[PDB]
């Protein structure tokens, strides 16, 4: 089965490994390194989406929007410290 | 390409009863690409410092702990550890 299914994650371990090897961040890449990176990306995305859905249910809406993402990012102190220097369209 | 399909899967898993917008999906993809790039750059720096020719799980953990804040970094490290364990299992 696919390495994504093997690791049980949802992000594409294969695409992550290919992007790493293409950017040439290093001569090689281990087998656990890509799984770990995919897991970290999935956890971060899951946290962002959780906060965005929470903000959406607070605002009484059925679809997440950039407003909900912004509200989530500025309500979570850690995400703010993480994306302070980040800009978003509209 | 993009991680839109995977972001949608994670969204349906965390909140199976909600949606998202086109701009919201784009912002999520930009965030995913940016986090990937930051972690990859930090990992490349650490590998060049250690004079290694292969990025490893230890390098990725160090990069994560250097990038993300404290509690978030610890949770991400725990998730990655569980993931790599299930993978090697």
């Amino acid at each position: 089965k696919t390495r994504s299914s093997r690791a049980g994650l949802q992000f594409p371990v294969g695409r992550v490994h290919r992007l790493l090897r293409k950017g040439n961040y290093a001569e090689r890449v281990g087998a656990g390194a890509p799984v770990y990176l995919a897991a970290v990306l999935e956890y971060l995305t899951a946290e962002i989406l959780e906060l965005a859905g929470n903000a959406a249910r607070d605002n009484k809406k059925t679809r997440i929007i950039p407003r909900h993402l912004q509200l989530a990012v500025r309500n979570d102190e850690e995400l703010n410290k993480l994306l302070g220097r980040v800009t978003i369209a509209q | 390409e993009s991680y839109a399909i995977y972001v949608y899967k994670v969204l349906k898993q965390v909140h199976p009863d909600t949606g998202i917008s086109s701009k919201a999906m784009s912002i999520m993809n930009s965030f995913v690409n940016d986090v990937f790039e930051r972690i990859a750059g930090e990992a490349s720096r650490l590998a060049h410092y250690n004079k290694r020719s292969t990025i490893t799980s230890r390098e990725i953990q160090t990069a994560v702990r250097l990038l993300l804040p404290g509690e978030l970094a610890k949770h991400a490290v725990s998730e990655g550890t569980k993931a790599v364990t299930k993978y090697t299992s």
Partner: peptide
């Protein structure tokens, strides 16, 4: 939204 064009699978090994 994940339409049929989005439900596509991956490629072979």
């Amino acid at each position: 939204n994940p339409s049929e064009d989005d439900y596509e699978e991956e490629e072979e090994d």
